[PDB]
Amino acid sequence: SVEEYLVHALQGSVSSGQAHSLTSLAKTWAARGSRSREPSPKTEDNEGVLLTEKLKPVDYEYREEVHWATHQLRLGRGSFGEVHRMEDKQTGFQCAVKKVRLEVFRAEELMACAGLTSPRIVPLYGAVREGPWVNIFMELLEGGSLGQLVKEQGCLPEDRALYYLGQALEGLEYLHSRRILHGDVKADNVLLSSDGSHAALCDFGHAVCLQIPGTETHMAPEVVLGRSCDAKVDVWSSCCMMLHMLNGCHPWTQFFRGPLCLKIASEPPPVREIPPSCAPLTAQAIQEGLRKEPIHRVSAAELGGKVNRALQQVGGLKSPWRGEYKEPRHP
Numbered sequence: 001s002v003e004e005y006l007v008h009a010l011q012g013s014v015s016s017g018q019a020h021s022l023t024s025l026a027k028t029w030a031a032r033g034s035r036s037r038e039p040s041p042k043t044e045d046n047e048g049v050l051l052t053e054k055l056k057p058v059d060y061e062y063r064e065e066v067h068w069a070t071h072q073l074r075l076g077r078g079s080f081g082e083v084h085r086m087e088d089k090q091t092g093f094q095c096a097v098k099k100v101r102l103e104v105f106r107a108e109e110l111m112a113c114a115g116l117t118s119p120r121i122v123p124l125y126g127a128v129r130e131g132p133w134v135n136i137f138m139e140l141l142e143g144g145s146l147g148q149l150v151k152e153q154g155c156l157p158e159d160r161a162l163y164y165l166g167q168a169l170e171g172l173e174y175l176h177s178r179r180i181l182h183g184d185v186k187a188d189n190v191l192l193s194s195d196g197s198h199a200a201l202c203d204f205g206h207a208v209c210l211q212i213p214g215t216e217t218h219m220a221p222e223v224v225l226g227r228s229c230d231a232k233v234d235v236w237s238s239c240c241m242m243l244h245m246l247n248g249c250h251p252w253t254q255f256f257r258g259p260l261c262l263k264i265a266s267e268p269p270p271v272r273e274i275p276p277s278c279a280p281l282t283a284q285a286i287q288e289g290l291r292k293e294p295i296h297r298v299s300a301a302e303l304g305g306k307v308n309r310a311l312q313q314v315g316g317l318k319s320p321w322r323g324e325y326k327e328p329r330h331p
């Protein structure tokens, strides 16, 4: 085999290379983090690949507190990874690290963003393993997550919400054309620029190749029902994110108590959660993104077009970055 020979050359070392190298190696991490465990020797293994010259391995090694280190205060944490500020001790370059255990690592997280070039998808700088400790390096975005932004603001003005959905739908489309599902699209998983003008998709831990969902409130009915699933799952999730941005709360939550699987399958789509004060086009785009049958549901491309035109309808991006708190919809 050609790939299994290529992979062996990469193992035990951290190297400068390209996307396919990291991708192929990550597969072995995912398979490795499943064994019945072994007594650790004196040699804790150090391997991975670095995708940019801004992060340099010295003598085929790249270890924490030796070649690089984290900064004050964590940037955030989800259900699987802790993210910190990072500095390479030689280059002096600043970026982000996501810390993931080997036992929960999926190779699809790197397969989904390695080498890919889109302003709407966070650049991946590489990933290195220190035994059972996986470190995922990526571009640092200083504006925090959309989830942080919505928690602080309460909810977003119509134009702001549309503006970010549009950007997220541009990232979703880029992925779907490369036959990759996101899996966990929500406000926590979209990063923002310092000035708030740029949004980028992050967190591909629930990614899956085309031909497990991330968040219950954002699950499409066809996932819940155990039916067949395609890229349309991300577009449903993105409209659940949209309602979260408009209302300041996740869908379903202010109406039902968990588990919500039954409700998502049994109830009509949560189109009643669209604020009545929204523009006709805004409400229309959400309604067709929240179509229960994925076949009759619009693609990321079709939805992106509809939200751009809806943004034009409300008069473009006019609302200020940050600004006044808007009281979330009352339960």
Ligand SMILES: Nc1ncnc2c1ncn2[C@@H]1O[C@H](COP(=O)(O)OP(=O)(O)OP(O)(O)=S)[C@@H](O)[C@H]1O
Residues within 6 Å of the ligand: 075, 076, 077, 078, 079, 080, 081, 082, 083, 096, 098, 122, 138, 139, 140, 141, 142, 144, 145, 148, 184, 188, 189, 191, 202, 203, 204, 205, 206, 214
């Ligand atoms: N590059 C980054 N710059 C700034 N903040 C980040 C960055 N990456 C992640 N964060 C923040 O840290 C949080 C956790 O990172 P995620 O990548 O979402 O990990 P996770 O939620 O455990 O992934 P899952 O659950 O496997 S889908 C995010 O919600 C962001 O708020």
Ligand SMILES: [Mg+2]
Residues within 6 Å of the ligand: 078, 079, 188, 189, 203
């Ligand atoms: Mg996350």
